[PDB]
């Protein structure tokens, strides 16, 4: 009986379904797939990308940037929600093919640098090409590109380095406070007494309160379904979107249910 | 007028004054210098080192390990209070010359990997040979060597990755709960509105409470003077040592004074 | 039409077929699978592993080490032929689970550190968990463990960092010069005018001459079939093995044929 | 007697003496100090920097780039002769303060990543802030920026990763083949039987022949004195410059003398 073959990280087809750029605000666009967020923020001083989705999405992202008028040299900065294969997958390749540098917190930087291997919960089951961070950010630190100010809000739990990124764009004339809040799921995680993450529960609890309080005229999430976006719905893609408060509440009620099921299991 | 010469990181002579091993408990020894802590914990399954002091202390540390019966192959694990040059200085060289692997949190790992460069407060003024961590630890995570259980307690502030390490040794027959608590100083730091560390004050405040609550029959600190140890005093080196509560209180009162002076300056 | 799913690196079943340890010489054992080499050299001062095969072979390797009397703490050193997924696959995990440190040349170290991603020929098609080298070796440099002396012989081509490792064991009473020569294949490679490897042909040519001249009483190769070993054949596993000269000649004739086919294609 | 204080890497004042930009060709400028080369190549598609000199030269380099019309965002690429503190010193800081990415061979990348520590000859005596390479180049590989084509020519010896960089600029109307050849010195090195560099002599010998053969209308070197440039001499700074052949011959005769002195010592 031979050892098992390596199993590829396969995902729902919608996660891999290319879409054209979808405008969120005056300078903010969804340029990923139908079910994975990849946000492009275009400034007079270069472009910012928040997440890239899966590893095989690099060329599609570059195609959509070109459609927006962003050449490789114009991409200056990559920010991440968290460093799992379905959100940071193409970062290494994007750095090779563009001018982009990566800013992340220390936890996300060390997970990115090992390509998602030795994951606290998934082991080596969900890996991707490693990449190095060019700048380490602290909680509450701001990064400014072309006068758009991005603020990091750590929300540890889904990964230790999970981060919400907030910035203010404009929509019609008016300012719109965008919150790109990270996943709050704990899929198959051991929550209680986890030796690799002893304070997991306390961190999730604190992260629910962080998300509740974000400046949040428009919430986006790495899996759009988590915040009730439908990127395939065109003009009403965002119509049903949750508030940050509703997203946090829904995630906490699910988390409490999982805790109770874990105690029973 | 030429640019200034590089300035070496020079320190008080006592920080560089070798001492023979000084026993703290049945399996725990101070093996550094008179004014820099480097703790050796000897187990039937290999030795653990907590800090190494300055970069030029590597050979002295190895000499003192040999005096204790610890060969290079026997050193299994290096733990750190924080990754500044005066505490992690010789880690790279020790890894090259021994069997030792490094365990640290993500923040300390990324500062160690850049040799203390791009420090949040010191810039490139205080650097040392970079080293890689072999294992990343989470807050409250335990590491066990030869049946001595080391628990990490994050106490961010002096550096983002500052850590207290606790373990239980024996003294005479009886269990002794040793707390190796990190520095709580903020020397020359900008405390309020620091763009590189926006939550600095809140982190220090939380770290005072962490130190206050450590299991703490005997407190040790990276600078022994901070906890009123006198390593040159032989049998009463530890006689005047502070409790963790007194160490935390003294550090918080100093911190409050610095905050007030900063507001006035 | 969604983007393609990630494709796993799947291999012939024999590459994943566990085997019990097979003795090559007094202190040298094949402990990998039927069709992937992983050599254990046991010394009174700890064990050396040369290659680990595929990423999923880590537990099997540890099982075979235990069968040989080598505990995790006893594994001191991992050496590599080259840093592709089918030979260095489990190195990251072995470092986490054992005392082992990795020694490699700079080229192999940088490919290992990126988990085989951005391969000169395979791109991101054949990746694995990244690992860091603890020691960088130069061509002709020796490493000594328990009095067995390992010499590195660079043989760039299959990868830039491809290395032959030689050492002298004993067999019956007599010294046996073992050559663990790396692959000399160029599978699907663009050989001529390759912008990522401009001197590829000259390096292969030099590497054929390096292999021809190795001290070589017994040749082993990462794919045993390349040197006509049959690890499933028991007492005559090595009976048909090639000399280093015959291995080099066969690889050069194949290489010349590929060059001619490339010119015609 | 305390252990010695750390000794700073101090250098001749002329190495630290700022100079205004000095034009070498239509798009190539010396922008370092009087006695350390730092070459800026300006293209319509961004700027390239070849070396930065000492760690404290970062702000001066940025000042001279601004004088040339190169903003931080416009610096796209840093190339290196070799990764010692007096040539790669400010690379980490330049990467933090500019858009620049680093391309280097594997040997230079691993020495840069450890900030010049664990040097084959200097140990930890000559270190600097570590930096990561963004692209690894092979011997003979070309990199193109704004239509200037840079070719790497490995010339191992002074360091394992020592590299000559060649490109063609224009001067008046006519093409000028510029060779930025690395140091060929071996200052205080053990040349024969060096366990950390067993093939040192053969590598130097091959590197003399590489330099002899470079396309070389104008030779520049990291220490301008090595090629008889005088950056303080204005219009005749380059008047006395050596050919690549004369530079190689002078370095080989010095090397042969050192070998003979080493045999006698
Ligand atoms: C590595 O990626 C994830 N796992 C998998 O893909 C596959 C799985 C492994 C173990 C349980 S599931 C993960 O991080 O668990 C995805 N990302 C998520 C997020 O919250 O970021 C969740 C999204 O929730 C749904 N059903 O859409 C679960 S799927
Ligand atoms: C980099 O090392 C430290 N700085 C210096 O050496 C030198 C300095 C730079 C800026 C202000 S001072 C640092 O971290 O600030 C030492 N370590 C300490 C700790 O708390 O770990 C403090 C100990 O307090 C005293 N007076 O003994 C201050 S000295
Ligand atoms: C990444 O691993 C290898 N590729 C594959 O597995 C699968 C392939 C990708 C592209 C062509 S094939 C590689 O390096 O090309 C294996 N290792 C080899 C060595 O020489 O090390 C060769 C062994 O030759 C045979 N037929 O046994 C080819 S298979
Ligand atoms: C680390 O830098 C160098 N060492 C020192 O600075 C100081 C020294 C340490 C040991 C011997 S000297 C080095 O690499 O040896 C400089 N760079 C050089 C090059 O060739 O790049 C040489 C230039 O020759 C002269 N006299 O100008 C020697 S000085
Ligand atoms: Zn995830
Ligand atoms: Zn996800
Ligand atoms: Zn400190
Ligand atoms: Zn200190
Ligand atoms: Zn291979
Ligand atoms: Zn192979
Ligand atoms: Zn040098
Ligand atoms: Zn030099």
Q: Cα(B145)–Cα(D152) distance, rounded to whole angstroms?
A: 49
B121 known member of a binding site: no
Token pair belonging to C66: 């235990």
Q: What is the DSSP letter of D242?
A: P
- All residues at 6 or more sequence positions from A174 whose CB lies less than 8 Å from its CB, including other chains: none
Ligand in closest contact with the CA of A122: 1
Measured CA to CA, the distance from residue B250 to residue B241 in angstroms comes to 13
Ligand 4 neighbourhood includes D183 CB (under 6 angstroms): yes
Burial class from Cβ neighbours inside 10 Å (0-12, 13-18, 19+) for residue C222 reads: buried
Burial classification of residue C106, based on how many CB atoms lie within 10 Å of its CB (0-12 exposed, 13-18 middle, 19 or more buried)? buried
Q: Is A121 annotated as a binding residue?
A: no
DSSP string, B27-95: TEEE-SBSSS--EEEEETTEEEEE--BSGGGHHHHHHHHHHHT--GGGEEEEE-S--SHHHHTTHHHHH
Tell whether the torsion through CA atoms of B14, B15, B18 and B19 is positive or negative: positive
Two tokens, residue A20: 């054209």
Q: Which CA distances in Å does C252 have to C104, C196, C249, C263, D13?
A: 25, 22, 5, 16, 55
Residue A58 CA to residue A56 CA, distance in Å, equals 6
* Token duo for residue C168: 């002298």
Among residues B10, B46, B53, the alpha carbon closest in space to that of B31 is found at B53
Q: Return left, alpha or beta for C179; rule: phi > 0 is left, psi -120 to 50 is alpha, else beta.
A: beta
Buried-exposed string C10-38: b where 16+ CB fall within 10 A, e elsewhere: ebeebbbbbbeebebbebbbbbbbbbbbb
Q: Is B181 helix (H, G, I), strand (E, B) or coil?
A: coil
Q: Tokens 């001197």 map to which residue?
A: C199
How far are the Cα atoms of B228, D184, D212, D226, D236 from residue D250, in angstroms, in the given order?
62, 9, 11, 9, 22
To 5 degrees, how large is the angle CA D88–CA D93–CA D95?
90
Cα A84 to chain centroid, rounded: 9
Least distant ligand from the CA of D187: 4
How many CB atoms sit inside 10 A of residue A259's CB? Answer: 15
Question: Which residues on chain D are in Cβ contact (under 8 Å) with B3?
Answer: 16-18, 33, 54, 56-57, 60
Contact B190, B258 (CB under 8 A): no
Q: How far is C161 from chain D (nearest CA, A)?
A: 10
Residue C18 and residue C36: Cα distance in Å, rounded? 10
Neighbours of C88 (CB within 10 A): 31
Q: Which residue of A102, A117, A138 is the best one to mutate when testing the B interface, meaning the one whose CB has the most B CBs within 10 A?
A: A138
Distance CA D41, CA D91 (A): 16
Of B172, B200, B197, which is closest to residue B185 (Cα–Cα)? Answer: B200
Q: Which residues are CB-contacts of D237 (< 8 A; sequence separation ≥ 6)?
A: D22, D30, D229, D230, D231
User: Rounded to whole angstroms, how far apart are CA atoms A55 and A8?
Assistant: 12
Contacts of A95 in chain D (CB under 8 A): 134
Q: What is residue A32's three-state secondary structure? A: coil
Return the CA Rg of chain D.
Answer: 18
Active site residue B84: yes
The enclosing H or E element of A212 equals helix A200-212
CA-C87 nearest atom, ligand 3 = 21
Nearest residue to D161 (alpha-carbon basis) of D244, D104, D224, D101:
D104
Q: Which of C9, C15, C88, C185 to probe ligand 3 with, by most ligand atoms within 8 A of CB?
A: C185
CA dist., res. D236 & res. C104, Å (int): 47
Q: What is the dihedral of CA D183, D188, D192, D197, to 10 degrees?
A: -60
Encoding tokens for residue C176? 């046996």
B183 lines ligand 2 (CB under 6 A): yes
Q: Which residue's structure tokens are 């300006």?
A: D42
| D88 DSSP β-pair partners | D53
Beta strand A135-136 pairing with A28-30: unpaired
Burial (CB < 10 A; 0-12, 13-18, 19+), residue B153, is buried
Q: Which residue has the tokens 């000794």?
A: D7
Which of A86, A111, A229 most suits a substitution to test ligand 1, by most atoms within 8 Å of the C-beta? A86
Indicate the pairing of strand D148-154 with strand D163-171.
antiparallel
Non-local (6+) Cβ contacts of B58 within 8 A are B52, B90, B93, B94, B97
Please report the resolution in angstroms.
1.6
Sort out which chain A residues have CB atoms less than 8 A from B106's CB and list them: 106-107, 109-110, 160-161
A242, two tokens: 């949750």
D25 vs chain C: nearest CA distance in angstroms?
28
A74 to A43, A100, A143: CA distances (angstroms): 10, 8, 17
Determine whether the interchain pair C132/B132 forms a contact, defined as Cβ–Cβ distance below 8 Å.
yes
Q: What contacts D193, CB < 8 A, 6 or more positions away?
A: none
Annotated catalytic residue A84: yes
For A251, the token pair is: 């995630």
**Percent helix / strand / coil, chain A, rounded to 5:** 30, 25, 45
Beta carbons of D242 and D212 less than 8 angstroms apart = no
Pocket test for ligand 4, best of D187, D191, D250 (most atoms within 8 A of CB): D187
Q: Specify the pairing of strand A218-220 against strand A174-180.
A: parallel
Specify the residue for token string 């008028």: A69
At residue D193, φ and ψ (nearest 5 deg) are 60, 35
The burial class, CB within 10 Å (0-12 / 13-18 / 19+), for B234 is exposed
Contact (Cβ atoms closer than 8 angstroms) between residue C92 and residue C132: no
C-alpha neighbours within 13 Å on the C-beta side of residue B58:
21
| D121 a catalytic residue | no
Chain B contact set for C91 (CB, 8 A): none
| In contact, C204 and C127? CB cutoff 8 Å | no
3-state SS class at D65? helix
Q: How far is it, in rounded angstroms, from Cα A198 to Cα A204?
A: 12
Name the packing angle between helices D200-212 and D244-264 (round to 10°): 160
Q: How far apart are CA B165 and CA B180, in angstroms?
A: 5
Q: Exposure of A256 by Cβ count < 10 A (0-12 exposed, 13-18 middle, 19+ buried)?
A: exposed
Q: Best residue in C12, C52, C111, C124 to probe A by mutation, most A CBs within 10 Å?
A: C124
A126 lines ligand 1 (CB under 6 A): yes
Q: Are strands B218-220 and C101-104 parallel, antiparallel or unpaired?
A: unpaired
**Cβ neighbours, 10 Å, residue A55:** 24
What does the DSSP assignment read for chain C? -PPPPP------GGGG-B---EEEETTEEE-SBSSS--EEEEETTEEEEE--BSGGGHHHHHHHHHHHT--GGGEEEEE-S--SHHHHTTHHHHHHHSS-EEEE-HHHHHHHHTTT-SBTTTBTSS-------SEE--TT-EEEETTEEEEEEE--SSSTT-EEEEEEEEETTEEEEEEEPPP---TT---TT-TT-TTHHHHHHHHHHHHHTS--SEEE-SSGGGGT--GGGGGGTTTTPPPHHHHHHHHHHHHHHHHHHHHH-
Residue C224 C-alpha to ligand 1 middle, in angstroms? 40
* Residue in B46, B51, B60 with CA at minimum distance from that of residue B17: B60
Alpha helices in chain B (DSSP H): 58-68, 85-88, 91-97, 106-113, 200-212, 244-264
Residues in chain B: 265
Q: Which residue has the tokens 């999730």?
A: A204
Say which of B189, B197, B204, B231 is annotated catalytic: B189
Q: Are A63 and A90 in contact (CB under 8 A)?
A: no
Q: How far apart are CA A245 and CA A116, in angstroms?
A: 30
- CA–CA separation, A148 vs A205, rounded Å? 30
Ligand 4: which atom is nearest the Cα of residue D185? 20
Nearest to A39 by CA among A15, A56, A14, A64: A64
Q: How many Å lie between the centroid of ligand 11 and the Cα of residue D223? A: 9
Using a 10 angstrom Cβ sphere, with 0-12 exposed, 13-18 middle and 19 or more buried, the burial of residue B230 is middle
Q: What angle do CA C95, B102, C45 make, to 5 degrees?
A: 55
Phi, psi of B101 (to 5 degrees): -110, 150
The Cβ of residue A241 has, within 10 Å, a number of other Cβ atoms equal to 18
Nearest CA among A231, A235, A250 for reference residue A64: A231
Q: Which helix (H) or strand (E) holds D171?
A: strand D163-171
Q: Report the distance separating Cα C6 and Cα B117, nearest Å.
A: 38
Contact C5 A16 (CB under 8 A): yes
Q: Which helix (H) or strand (E) holds D30?
A: strand D28-30
Please work out whether the CB of residue A14 comes within 6 Å of at least one atom of ligand 1. no
Asked if B265 contacts B259 with a C-beta cutoff of 8 angstroms, the reply is no
Bridge pairing between strands D39-43 and D28-30:
antiparallel
Burial of residue B88 (CB within 10 Å: 0-12, 13-18, 19+) is: buried
Ligand 11 centroid–CA D246 distance in Å is: 20
Instruction: Check CB contact under 8 Å for A124 and C60.
Output: no
How far apart, in Å, do the first and last CA atoms of chain D sit? Answer: 32
Provide the edge-to-edge strand list for the sheet that holds C135-136. Answer: C22-25, C28-30, C39-43, C46-50, C75-79, C101-104, C135-136
- In what helix (H) or strand (E) does residue D179 lie, and over which residues does it extend? strand D174-180
CB–CB of A225/A183 below 8 Å? no
Helix axes D106-113, C106-113, angle to 10 degrees: 70
Residue with tokens 């001279």: D64
Residues in C lying within 8 Å of B, measured between beta carbons: 45-46, 73, 76, 95-96, 99, 101, 132, 134-135
Q: How far apart are CA C162 and CA C79, in angstroms?
A: 11
Distance CA C15, CA C35 (A): 5
Torsion (CA) B79, B83, B85, B88 in degrees, nearest 10 = 10
Q: How many CB atoms lie within 10 A of CB B73?
A: 15
For strands B39-43 and B75-79, give the pairing: unpaired
Dig out the tokens for D260 from the structure: 């003979």
Tokens representing C169?
């064991």
What is the per-residue burial (b if ≥16 Cβ within 10 Å, else e) of A208-235?
bebbbebebbbbbbbbbebbbbbbeeee
Name the β-bridge partners of A167.
A178
DSSP H helical segments within D76-118, as ranges? 85-88, 91-97, 106-113
CA neighbor of D79 nearest in space, from D34, D146, D143: D143
- Contact residues, chain A to chain B, C-beta under 8 Å: 106-107, 109-110, 120, 136, 138-142, 160-161, 195-199
Chain B residues touching residue A107 (CB < 8 angstroms): 106
C-alpha dist (Å) from residue B6 to C205, D9, D13: 47, 6, 12
């Amino acid at each position: 009986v031979p050892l098992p073959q390596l199993r590829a990280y396969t995902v729902d087809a919608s996660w891999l379904q290319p879409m054209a750029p979808l405008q969120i605000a005056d300078h903010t666009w969804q340029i990923g797939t139908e079910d994975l967020t990849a946000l492009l923020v275009q400034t007079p001083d270069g472009a910012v990308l928040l997440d890239g989705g899966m590893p095989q999405m690099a060329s599609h992202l570059l195609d959509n940037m070109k459609a927006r008028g962003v050449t490789p040299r114009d991409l200056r900065l990559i920010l991440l929600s968290h460093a799992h294969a379905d959100h940071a997958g193409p970062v290494a390749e994007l750095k090779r093919r563009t001018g982009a540098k990566v800013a992340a917190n220390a936890e996300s930087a060390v997970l990115l640098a090992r390509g998602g291997s030795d994951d606290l919960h998934f082991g080596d089951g969900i890996t991707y090409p490693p990449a190095n961070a060019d700048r380490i950010v602290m909680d509450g630190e701001v990064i400014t590109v072309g006068g758009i100010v991005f603020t990091a809000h750590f929300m540890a739990g889904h990964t230790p380095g999970s981060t919400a990124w907030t910035w203010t764009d404009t929509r019609n004339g008016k300012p719109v406070r965008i919150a790109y809040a990270d996943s709050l799921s704990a899929p198959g995680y051991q929550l209680q007494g986890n030796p690799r993450y002893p304070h997991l529960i306390e961190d999730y609890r604190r992260s629910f309160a962080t998300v509740r309080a974000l400046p949040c005229d428009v919430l986006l999430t790495p899996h759009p379904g988590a915040s009730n976006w439908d990127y395939a719905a065109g003009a009403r893609a965002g119509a049903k979107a949750l508030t940050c408060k509703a997203y946090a509440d829904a995630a906490e009620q699910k988390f409490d249910g999982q805790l109770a099921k874990e105690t029973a299991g």
